[PDB]
Ligand binder design. Structure first.
Ligand SMILES: C[n+]1cn([C@@H]2O[C@H](COP(=O)(O)OP(=O)(O)O)[C@@H](O)[C@H]2O)c2nc(N)[nH]c(=O)c21
Ligand SMILES: *SCC1=CC(C)(C)N(O)C1(C)C
Ligand SMILES: *SCC1=CC(C)(C)N(O)C1(C)C
Ligand SMILES: *SCC1=CC(C)(C)N(O)C1(C)C
Ligand SMILES: *SCC1=CC(C)(C)N(O)C1(C)C
Lengths: 100, 213
């Protein structure tokens, strides 16, 4: 029937700060982040996702849905200004091509 | 030509391994953005705090910051949740550059037309509508929205709040059209609510701009 522990936990953690977002904290995340393929280039898994939202704006390339950007505001809660020059200066931009 | 159906397990192959790459948006992250959000435009982020203007200088107050083609930047300043009725009035906020940059004292040279929206002050959920239009305008300038626009501006006062919309020009006709859209953004309803200020008058603050609904 049962030979061992059928209950195994895998990377649970899920517990950072008391729910307070800081510019240095988040911007610090960028210090060790990966590049970007573009909005619709990356499907954000978390009750959201920008597939064609603004992609219909014609020419797309770099169109960030109005509602999408909004979501950002939710997690962006971090009055920046200083760390900005520190991280903002890092923000990388990649042209959505690959195929042709 | 097939369409959105997916009635076959051939088009897709359930199987992966060491799947290179690994993006992480601020949405799915919540505390670890492993990806930098870039755009195809240029826009700085200046926030004016009119108070020492008494004898300081419009250029001595204005605080220019975030100037990139991303979202985490301009979004932060929004995190301030100041909005058009959540921060010390008599304030100002302008983000743009796609065409010019200087300011209402030169940017106009660019847009040529200043579409402002005067509001007696409400305080509900206008900051979302005013933004959805601005954020999209700068974040989605590729076309459709900020087809050729130049930039946007903000200006709060006693009355309540007033947002400006700068357009490269592309003829005012198309503007009267754009403004209309921004009109609703103001959360009005037949009240007209709208302001048209020609650059030629913006700089020299000449009397009799264009109109004011
Ligand atoms: C926007 N702006 C305003 N001022 C000064 O502040 C005064 C008020 O400007 P305003 O008519 O309230 O402009 P706005 O609503 O479009 O921001 C003007 O008489 C200007 O002398 C400005 N002065 C400079 N140098 N540059 C600017 O961009 C600027
Ligand atoms: S919000 C419209 C408005 C404000 C104020 C300056 C008090 N006014 O005279 C009008 C009614 C134009
Ligand atoms: S502009 C963003 C927006 C509009 C409305 C439909 C009023 N909303 O609920 C949000 C805040 C998503
Ligand atoms: S503002 C008038 C105008 C029209 C167009 C031909 C698009 N232009 O380049 C200017 C801005 C001079
Ligand atoms: S209204 C045209 C105009 C205004 C000002 C900034 C004073 N100028 O130099 C010109 C003549 C272009």
């Amino acid at each position: 029937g049962s030979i061992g522990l059928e209950a195994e936990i895998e990377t649970t953690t899920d517990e950072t700060d008391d729910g307070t977002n800081t510019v240095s904290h988040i911007l610090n995340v960028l210090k060790d982040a990966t590049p970007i393929e573009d909005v619709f280039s990356f499907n954000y898994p978390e009750g959201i996702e920008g597939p064609d939202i603004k992609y219909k704006k014609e020419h797309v390339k770099y169109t960030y849905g109005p509602t999408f950007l909004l979501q950002f505001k939710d997690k962006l809660n971090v009055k920046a200004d200083a760390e900005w020059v520190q991280s903002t200066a890092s923000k990388i931009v990649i042209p959505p091509g690959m195929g042709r | 030509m097939s369409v959105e159906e997916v009635s076959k397990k051939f088009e897709e192959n359930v199987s992966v391994d060491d799947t290179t790459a690994t993006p992480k948006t601020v949405l799915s992250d919540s505390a670890h953005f492993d990806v930098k959000h870039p755009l195809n435009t240029k826009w700085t982020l200046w926030y004016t705090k009119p108070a020492v203007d008494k004898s300081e200088s419009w250029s001595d107050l204005l605080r220019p910051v975030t100037s990139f083609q991303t979202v985490e930047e301009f979004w932060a300043i929004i995190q301030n949740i100041p909005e058009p009725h959540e921060l010390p009035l008599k304030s100002d906020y302008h983000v743009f550059r796609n065409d010019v940059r200087p300011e209402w004292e030169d940017e106009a040279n660019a847009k040529g037309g200043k579409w402002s929206f005067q509001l007696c002050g409400k305080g509900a959920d206008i900051d979302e509508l005013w933004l959805c239009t601005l954020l999209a305008v700068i974040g989605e300038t590729i076309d459709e929205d900020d087809s050729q626009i130049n930039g946007v501006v903000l200006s709060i006062r006693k009355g309540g709040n007033k947002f400006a919309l700068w357009t490269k020009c592309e003829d005012k006709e198309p503007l009267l059209r754009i403004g209309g859209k921004f009109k609703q953004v103001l959360k009005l309803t037949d009240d007209g609510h709208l302001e048209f200020f020609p650059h030629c008058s913006a700089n020299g603050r000449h009397p009799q701009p264009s109109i004011t609904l």
